[model samples]
Each structure stands twice: as structure tokens, then as C-alpha cells.
Target chain A: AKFTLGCLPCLGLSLVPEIATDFYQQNSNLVMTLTAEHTETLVKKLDLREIDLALTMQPVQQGDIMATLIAEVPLVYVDKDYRQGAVEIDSIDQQRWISPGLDSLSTAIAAHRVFPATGLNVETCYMAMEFVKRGVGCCITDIFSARHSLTPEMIHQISPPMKIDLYLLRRADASLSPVTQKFVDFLCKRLRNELREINLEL
Target chain B: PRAKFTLGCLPCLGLSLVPEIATDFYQQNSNLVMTLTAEHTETLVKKLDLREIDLALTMQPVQQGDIMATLIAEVPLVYVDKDYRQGAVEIDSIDQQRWISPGLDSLSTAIAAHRVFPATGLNVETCYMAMEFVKRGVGCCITDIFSARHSLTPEMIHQISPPMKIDLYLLRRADASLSPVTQKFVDFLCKRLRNELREINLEL
Candidate 1:
């Protein structure tokens, strides 16, 4: 049997590969197709039954879709050079900032906090993180997304710290196939442990 | 008046060229404020035609009558990863190693890479993600030399026995009159990108 897993770009870039590799090793028989999209689109896909599962950020509570808190993904500031000490959110005002477009939940949270009204806006944090790698600009993104592309020294934890709640969504009414259930349990356990590992670093 | 120069770039070249824009381009153009966005080639084309951006760095065959396209370079492909390979290897020889892809939509060159080795691992969104996976020993990937040079050392990158290539293009609307700043930006891209490609051992 095959299943489709939709995820937010940050988690998709950072966590999905490790999860896909591990899960496939354990359940070699079942096929898993992964897609990276925003949370709302993932939720829409879930309602249409187009995807079997979605790993996302805070989703609007809906009755038919089950949204489980997966992890509280910590957001941080990153640039080309290494810097010591956390920075005030407003400190980023005139700097060349890279961030996801207006639709992103993390961007929305940042907007509420201290993000500038305009800068370099892209489709996903995945893309924003790319810009960060090339010394193009600093960005506000989850630590997991920044881990591989950036070093720990190059990343600065935000002052007062900022976080977005990650959610794993699936249809509440649908009875899971045996393979899907096993995969969900495996994903949840692995995700929590992985988040905990990175969580301790900041 | 400060001129806003909006530019689009394909994901493959986006990471590699960003530093150039941030440093080189930014330094030279004090009065021109630039914004560089990376999107899929298709998205870039749409944005270009819609005038959302001034121009784009992408693959050729733009095929739009209203758009003037210039072929900047035909970049050769290389097998890049942390695990080094000696000399050039055949496409089939590396098929057994897990392959990380820079999403089919993002890399036009993926067509050639996928023909020999079907992507067995993740289909990531950018070239950087593919490189990161390779660094973690997740798998290997084939990408343009420009992108390879940007992230990996020369020893970590190897040539494919029969090297494949993709054409890079700079596209702008032919119907519109170029602002002096945008024209200068275009000249800078042409000169600077060729220099970048040459530095990577690719003859422009």
C-alpha cells in the first residue's frame, strides 16, 4: 500500500528526509510519497482525502480533521557570520531580511512580534534558508530548518525566544489502514525525540 | 529617486548567485535597491511576464515573443557529495547510491539525472537541500557545476563520464524600455556570471 504525506516546507526540508529514510527502512513494503506545501493547503488536501497525513504548523481547529501537537518548533535568527548573544526582534528592521511570504504562520507570528513590513519574501522558509546560506541576508526560521545549511554558531536564538506549534493532521473520520497507523505512531515518536534533541541546543 | 530592481532566479542558480548580488551588485549600485527572489522556472516566467519582476536568471527556451532571452552559459553537470569519487564515473555506476533530488519542478537538468538514476530518496525544494542531504550521508545528487562550486569543494565534486549540461538564460521583457539602472544590472549579471562560471572551470 502507498500513502501521501504533506508537510510544511521547514519540516519538509529539515526533518522529512531523516524520517522518510528511517520509516522506509522499517516499513519497506509500503510506499510513502512526500510533498511540501503550506499548512492551509495541506489541510485542504486532507479534507479532500488527497493526502494521508500532514505535518504542519498551527492549524485552525476544524471538527473533521484531527490536529495533534507534534512539537513546538523554536524560531531563531541566522546570517552568514557567527554572532554571540540573542538579538532584540526590532534590531532586524533595516537589515536585509529574508522570510516566507505573508501567508506563512511563522511570518504571521513574526509580523505580530517585530518583523519589518517588507523585505525579501519568498514562497517558503526553505527558500529563505537558501538565501541565508549564501550570505544574502539574515532570516527568522526554525532551528531544525537552519541546522543543515547553517552552523550553530551562525544562528542566534531570538531574545525572549519565539516558537510555532507544529501539528500532525489527518482525517478524524477515516479509519486508518494498518500501514498508515504504524507510520503515524513511528513518525510521532521520532518527531518528538528529534525536536527534543534540537530543543536542548538553544 | 531610488529605483527598485526586482529580479527572479531559478532555484538551481539562486543560492549560488545570491552572494554575488548581496555583495558585488549591492556595492556597485548605491541608488538601485534590488530584491532577488528564487522560484521555479515556470513561476519565474509567469512572474516575469506579469511584470512582478524586472528580469530572471533561468533555463533557456523561454519562447515568449514579448520576452528577450540571452543564453549566458551552458553549464556542465557534475556529481557532487561529501563522499568523493575518483575521476569521472558513469551514470549507471552511481545508480546504486541513494539519490537526493532538487525537486523535479526546480531543476530542469534533473531530467537528465533522473533518466539514468530514478530519484530513490527525497525530492527537496532547493539545490542546498540536496547538498545538505549528501553532507549527512543521506544520498548523492547531480547538479550544475555553478551550484556544485558554490557549496562543495573541488575534491568532493566529480565529472560524469559523459558530462551533461543545461543552458542558463537571462530574460527580460522585450516590449518594455529598460531603465538605466535595470540595464546596468543586466550588464553586471552578464559580466559577473561569466566570471563566476569561468572560475568554476566552465568556459562561458
Candidate 2:
């Protein structure tokens, strides 16, 4: 019997580089092909059995899909100026604002809630900081993204914070073989290593 | 006399050497102010036609009517993510997944992605954003070694198969006369790029 493991695109990228082939070498017959699928779409495919399991940033709720919370990504306001200089949280209404996009779940929710105007939209936290670098506007991003694109003269603080939980999803009626079950446990443990590296409490 | 130089870069260009080059050049000739602007490559090309910027670091530039692209370096493209690796990943299956494009209208970065992976209705983000998105497991992106090295962790990169290397060029308006400061900076950059490119080959 053979089965393929499916997951969120980004997680798959991270997992394969750090652990995928090594897992295959130790235990034969489990070949992981990681591809990109957003949370909602991935869940539906999980429902249809196109994929075995999914790793997602947002939680999923569906009759055929079961989700388990794996990690929590704490979000923050990473300024073009990280945490200082001409900073005005209460006056955000009057100032220019930058967002990841309308579809980005919690980031959009938090950004729009504070700056109702939420003018000038970009796609990700990295671009928000890049725009901020060029004098566009301020933005919101998690610490991981913020620290990854760290720049000189840039600042950030965890203001009125937000968080996106990473969940592991599978078909409600699904039954994984013993090895796959062990593999799933390995996935959770790898995710914990990421959080631990950031000094974040699990 | 005070001199001003405006150089444009594609948003995801990640020209970390700008500071280094500028520092070295400015030491020899004081009274020079370099204004570097990063935008989508298409927009930067538009600036060239409008004479807004004197020089630009470009990939797959459009509006070639007056633009001349000088070959500066050939960089190998790479795939980066937070995943487990057993030496090398298959390149052909790459197109089956989504991509994090460097810019919505960037002809060069888009061409780079299409050259190796899927190309339809791309999810375009700046280099910084794309890196973050890739990190979050939203999707994967194809980028040159410079970008991969700049934005991702060392452990998350995958290398194999050259779908032809990334061709980076220095673009300028073909018809315009370069100012002393502009020409000098251009030559300095072109020369320095070769030196840096030597170090790049050692990465792959």
C-alpha cells in the first residue's frame, strides 16, 4: 500500500528542506510530494480524498474535515519604523495605512478594525515593510516575517497584537497507517522546533 | 558641484550591494547623493522612458523602445522553503504548485518563475512579502541565488537543474547621454557585479 502526504505549500517547503527526505530514508515507501494549496481549498480536497492531511495557518471547520491546533503565530504591528519615531496608535485613523490584502484573514481584520480607512493594500508583511521603507505607510505582520526581512533603521513593536493558529487537518473518517500516524507526529514536532527557535512559548 | 544619481531597482531585486558600492564610490568622489528607488520592473522601465531615472537594475523589462539592457550577471535560480530535503527535488513537478511572484507586473521575475514553474494567475508580492508568504506556507517562489540567500534560512533552500540561469542586466535609455556621475556609477556597478558573481557561483 502507498499514500502521499499533502500539506500547505509553505509548510511543505519548510518541512521537505528540514525533514522530508530524511523521513523517507529511514522509513521506505512514504514519498512526500509537497505542493501549494490554501487552507480552504486544501480542506475541500482533503474532504474529497485528493490529499491525506493538510497544514494550514487558519483553522478549518467542515463536516468531513477534522482539525487539530498545532501552532500559534502571534501577529504584531511591524512599522516601517518597527517600534519608534512619530508613532501614533490612537491617531491611526488620520495616518496612512498599509494592509496585506482584504483576503488575509486576521491581518486584514486587525488592520481594518484599527484604521478603518485601511488605505493602500499590499500582498504580504514583507512588502508592507518594503513599502514602509520607501515612505508609503505602516503595516501589520507576525514577528517571524518581520524579523526575516529585518532592515536598518526599521523598527517594530507587538502593539494590539493578533495571532493565526496553525492547524493540522484530515478527513473526519480518515484512518492513517501506523507509519503515517508516526509521520503526523513528526510533523507536529518539527513545527514545534520552529516556534522554539523563535523563543516563542508553545 | 553637487551631483545627483537616481537608480531604480525591481522591488524584489534585493541589491544589498548598493550600500557597499555607494560607500566605496562616494569615498573617492564626495558630494554625490545616490537616490535609489525600488518598484515593479515595468514601472521602472516607464521611468526610464520618462527620464525619471538614469539607470536601473532590471530583469525582463518591457517597453524596449528606448531601453538598452547591458548584461551584468547570470545567476542560477533556486527554490526555498521550510521543508525536508534529500539532496535535490524534482524540477518538472514545480509547475503544479502555486507561486509567489516578485511583482504583479514584473516581466522578468514572472518570466523567471514561468521559466521553471507554473505561470498562470500568479500571487505577486514584493520580495520581502513573497519571502514571508513562502515562510508561512502560503506558497512557494522561484528566485535567483541572491534573493534566496537574502530572504530565506540556509536550511530551507533546494538546488538542482538549470532551466537556464537568471539573466540580470543593467538597463538605461539607449538614446540618452549619460551624465558623468551616471556613467561612472554604471561602470562601477557592472564591474563590481562580476566580482560578486564569482562569489555567487561558489554558493550553488
Candidate 3:
């Protein structure tokens, strides 16, 4: 009841917390309250010793963390007809953002992969894709881009593979709490099994 | 180069219908271009009144004052997640499980989600995030089938005992008839959405 776990980069990785929630639901002494927060900052949660586990598209080099790569997903440039193949983030130097406008992960990778693109600070990835759907400029994504529409025609897949290494991370110094290890194991096995269903090559 | 019409949606879930709707409307009547913007029902109603948007895809079918809502579909809400043990069984001991829910913007649907999840902190991403939240074990959510349809893995799909269903409304101003442009899209939705609902896993 009192004990809860926190996860971050909520927009793209909303399901990041699903495994931990299931882990504690099985007759545990503590009631697992799972929270998926939208943040450009999650270190405060760790510094305050507030979370047990987290999932991120990037890495957690902070606090000597125990980082495990959970899923290797790709960062995609999307369009209609999966649109006309796709253009690179290279020439994207002067367009306002279309979605995931202002966030840590989206912007980090956007900036890392393609700089000089920026605009209105919003969190919804669907709206960005909507903007893209209307011939608006694009935002790179793994899932939320097509979360609403999964049609292969509507799906714009960027090739040459820009990858996002989705990882499960925990604080090494957090006493390695019993539930933490159990959850890490529980989540790792289940998430691997889960992704295997989505992308068969996994 | 005739008229510019804009439509509003709650985002993600309702997007399934857009590609077809836009293509049909424009091809049939090349005189106008129908554009859509996504927002919650709160803004949907607000923009309807302000004339910021012409029509809204929302859940509340209201005939209050000038606003009118048309019944689009009855979205069946389900408890789907990765932890669901591979069979449709009624959940009796679920008060302790963590909850994932959309940050519902409409007045009525928010109340319904509260009945199921109450203190839901995590909000909107339509069905994609709703299913992902469930798959990742963050929690389970109750969402309309249109929202959930995109992500329902065969194994993830499940049924509830007393089955929960919600209605979606095509909100517009009641005092006036539809624009020839908006009418065609509405006519398309009126026809297509029903057929789409019939194709999904039905519990009702």
C-alpha cells in the first residue's frame, strides 16, 4: 500500500511498468502501487530513494546503477506508405517539432540523431503523428507513432536501423532489496517473452 | 480551394478511421479539404463552441443548448494486460492490482474510469499505451474497443464478467445542419464505425 514503484519516459514506454505491477500482485506483503510519470527528470526519484525499478530508451549512468537491456527497439522516421521510404534527421535543421515535442527521451534522441529541430513543448506522441498524418513534419518514434493506427500502409518504417536500447535499471546502492531482485528477475523474463511476441526475431 | 473544414478528435484511438475518412471525402468532393486535429473532449466541446473546430469525436452524446452528439459506437471496455492468465475469467480479487488508465478528457467517461480505477494517475495514449501499460505490468486499463483494437494481442485479449461498454459521440452544434463537407465525413463515419465495431471481439 505505502510502497510504490516509479517508471519514466511515460509517453513512449507506458507499458514499462507492467511487469513489476504483476510481480507484486501475487500475494505479496506490500501493495504495489505502480506510477508511470512523464518527466524530463527522474534522478530526483532516485536521489530521494523513491523508486525500485525503471525502464528507459537511453541509459542510466547515474548512481552506479544495475542496467540491463530489456529490448532492442528502433527509432523510426514515420510517414504514409510507411511514406516514400523516409528522410534522415540530417536535413531536419529548421523544422518545428511535430510530436513528443518536449521530453527527455524524444528530444535527447532527436537532438542526438538530428539537431536544429525544435518547437512547442507537449507530451502526446499521437498528436505529433496526427500532425505528421496531415503532411506535417515528423518526429522519430518506436511505438507511440502508430499506437493508434497499426495498418502497414499507415506505418512509416525508417530503414538502416537507428536503434533504441530499452533497458531495465535499478539503483545498485539501494540495498538490493529482496522485492527488487525478485521483480527484476520477474520483469526481465516476462518482458523478454513479451517482446518476443511483437518482433519474432527477438 | 472551396472550403477549409477542421475536425477534432481525442487522439490515437479514433485515428483508425481518419485515413479512410479523409481520402473518401476529398476524392468525392475535391472542392474542399477536411483536416483533423486531436484533442480531448474538454477542448472538443470548448472548440465546438468557439468555432475553433467543426466536429468533435467524443463520448458524451449531449443535446444540451446548441451542442448535439451523434451515437457513433458503443466501445466495450476490457481489462487486458500481460498478466491476464490466458483465459477470460471474471476478476473478483482485483482491488489490490495497480491500475493504468487514460487521462480521460470528457466529463462522463472520466467518471466511468473513476468507478473502475478511481485514483488513476497515468493517463492518455489511447489503446497503444493502454495495452503497453498492461503488457509491461504497469497496470491494467478500461478503454473503448476502438482504442484497444490496435494492440490486442490474441493472448492479451480477455473478457470481464458484467462487461463494461461506453458510447462515443460525434459532437457538433445542434442548431445547424452539417456542412456538405462535414456531412459527408459524418455520413462515412456513421456507416463505417458500426461495421468496424461488428468486426471486433464482442462481449455485449
Candidate 4:
């Protein structure tokens, strides 16, 4: 009767209907609730069943939550200007940095590897770049955000390459409603197609 | 002439403040001289810490030992669908679509993917030269209401509902001492920011 879907902001939620329509065709009574938030919060909520389904970063280890790898994305460091030669990690260190938030996984990773004593605690990613372009700080983010055109002035670089896994998460409970099953199936199929398209483009 | 402070700021939006609003504020009380360098935040922060720039207006907050952050206003960011006003276009309609965007390094792409329509594959095209693609009906874009409101042509552009929002932050050096003039300028900007927020809310 009630189906809820939780998702991350800015990754891709527009595709939800492909799954919704398949099960609820002409069934006006089917209720689908959609909520969006940061990736970490989405995963936590999925564990609590605050929502029935979630699409987030892969390798989530929260208890009782099932994670399915949907896609793999490249991770890169972005700067304000284009560099003519190979990118070096020291150069990244010399620049100012921008990132999601201090608590974000990306920031945590960068802090551990780059500046352990002082981790990134930027207010927001875009604002961080505003600083980056002025040669303030460099930011590490996924290729998807860089590709979506948040900052044109910023350049994507690959000194040490990294990648991220996109995932779909659901509760481990055995019981499933017809609507939930339909939605999950639909998402799996769509994700495969989307990944194929991205590969083709690459 | 007094001590000259090199301040870094974002060009498009930030230019409106510096040497104009900011310079005017600094000139009132002290004989301090301010020089503003218009650059993106990423670059500015690096310069600030390196001591290349004395101060900066940035959206990204940094946690370096020498860097300090001042809380500013949060701006609402949103997605602008090109086809929404025509009718309720399903999310899947974006499959095989070409999106015209500011550049690929922004949070817009992440937002686009996050709000992606189910079953529809979105092909985002990053354009640094111009926003003509969206005007030419290439694809939709995600932007702040302030930029969209001023940049878009009414008959040609329609504001999409459920706009995406992002916050703006002001940053400076953590250990550096601010002169009376520089401190006053920061205070003036903060006050104006509050007034700007009231004005923006009134518009909504």
C-alpha cells in the first residue's frame, strides 16, 4: 500500500518513475514517497527503515542493510586552472582546498592522506572552488559533480587516480510487497542501462 | 595611503561587492588601501594560506591550522527544467538528453544526477564558453535563483519548481591579526549580507 524511496541529492533521482510506473500502472492507489538527502544520512535511514529503498555510495556496512553495486565512478582532484603537465600530489597540497563538508567521506580520505592534523572543514563544495580558482585550495570530488558543471573555471586533474562505487540499498527483511519488488527490479534494469550509456560515452 | 590588503573574491558575483561596496566601507574610517583580486574560491584559499592574498570571500570553508572561517549567508540552489512549463515532463524523458551546464567542476552535476528522472539516462555536457546550449534548447541546467533570475530571458527561460540550494561561506586566515580597517570592512559586508537576505526573502 505504501512505498517509500530515499535517495541522495545530485546523483540521480529523476529515474525513479521507470520503476514506479511498471508496478503501479493505472493503479492510482499505490503510494510512492520520495525523499532526498546526503549519502551518509540516506544509508543510515535505510538501516532504520525510515524509507524502503536507497541509492547511495557503494560498500555501505551499516547493519541489516543490503547494498548492491550499481555503478563505478572516477574520483579526481579539481583546480581552478588547467595544468599543462602531469599533476603531482605536492602541488595539490600547496593549493587551498574545497570539499563537501568536514565530515564527508571524501574529506576524511583526503585528510588522512594529505593533511591529517587538519582535515578539510569547508562550508560547501562550490564555495570551496571559489577559493580554489583564486589559488586558495584544491578540492577532491567525483567526476560526476565535476562533469555536471558546478564550476567551469575549475579543472579536473589526476595525479593519483581514484574511483567511487554507486550502490542501491534495501532492507534485509524477507517480506516484500508487490510494489516494492517491482520498484527494485525496475531500478536494477535502469541502472544497468545508465551505466552502459556512460561507458559508451567514455 | 595606508597598508594595502590584497583580497581575493569570486569574479561574477563578488565583483559587485569589492572596490564598490567593500572599498567604500573601508574608506570611511581609515586611510587603508584595499586591492581585490577576482578569482574563484579554490584559488583564493590557496593564496590566502600562502600569504599571497591578505583576505578572501569564499563559499568553501577550510580547516587548515592557519585558515579561519566566518559564517555568512546560505544561498538557495535549485534545478531549472527547460521543459517543465510546457507540461509535466516525466523524469525518464531525459534519456539520451544533452544538458548544457556552466562547467563540470560544480555541484550542479551531482544535483542533476541526484534528481535524475528514473529510466532516463542524462548526458551532461559541460560548457565553459557560454550557456547558449540551454537557450538553444539543448538541455536543462541547475543554478542559483539569483544568477538564473538575472541571466535568463523570461520568454525563453522558465523557472523550474523545487529549486536546488547551496550555502555560501566567508573565509580568512586563522592566525593573522586583522587591522581595524579590514575588520570594519568585514563587519560592513556581514551587515549588508543580512540586508541582502531580507531583500531576497521578500522577493520569494
DockQ of each: 0.24, 0.03, 0.12, 0.02
A77-153: candidate 1 lDDT, tens digit per residue: 88766466787777764457654655545465555475553445555554566666666677777777677567676
Would you list the rank order by DockQ, best first?
A: 1, 3, 2, 4
Q: How far is B104's C-alpha from truth in model 4 (Å)?
A: 28
Per-residue lDDT over B1-204 for candidate 1, one digit per residue giving the tens place of the 0 to 100 score = 456767777655655465455456655555555666666566678788888888888866576858888988766778876775567866777755476655544244454554644534355545654654565666677777765776667777888767667777888888867777778778878888877666655531
> Which segments of candidate 1 are over 4 A away from where they belong?
A3-9, A30-68, A79-83, A90-100, A105-138, A168-181, B30-33, B81-85, B96-126, B136-138, B146-156, B176-178
lDDT scores for all predictions?
0.68, 0.58, 0.56, 0.52
Interface RMSD of each: 4.4, 11.5, 7.6, 12.7
Across residues A1-202, which tens digit of lDDT does each residue of candidate 4 receive? 5666665533421334333434444344444555444565567667677777777765665687878887765555677564533355556653234434443446435643654322223333333433444554466765554545345445455555555677878778735687567667777777667656754543
Report how closely model 4 matches the true complex, as a DockQ value.
Answer: 0.02
Chain B only, TM-score of each candidate = 0.84, 0.81, 0.79, 0.71
Candidate 3 chain A: 10-residue stretch with minimal lDDT = A114-123
What is candidate 3's lDDT per residue for A1-202, written digit by digit as tens?
3344545433333444455445545735544445444332344465566665566665667666666788766556655433445455663424434445444456556645644424322244554455556653455666534544334454544544455666766677766556555666776787677665645431
Candidate 1 chain A weakest lDDT stretch, 10 residues? A117-126
Per-residue lDDT over B40-116 for candidate 2, one digit per residue giving the tens place of the 0 to 100 score = 56557777888877788876644477888887877666676666663554556464455544443333444555464
**Which one is best on lDDT?**
1
Tell me the deviation in Å of residue B153 in model 3: 1.5
DockQ score, prediction 1:
0.24
* Cα error of candidate 4 at position A91, Å: 3.8
Q: Estimate each model's TM-score.
A: 0.77, 0.50, 0.55, 0.50
Consecutive 10-residue window with the lowest summed lDDT within model 3 chain B: B105-114
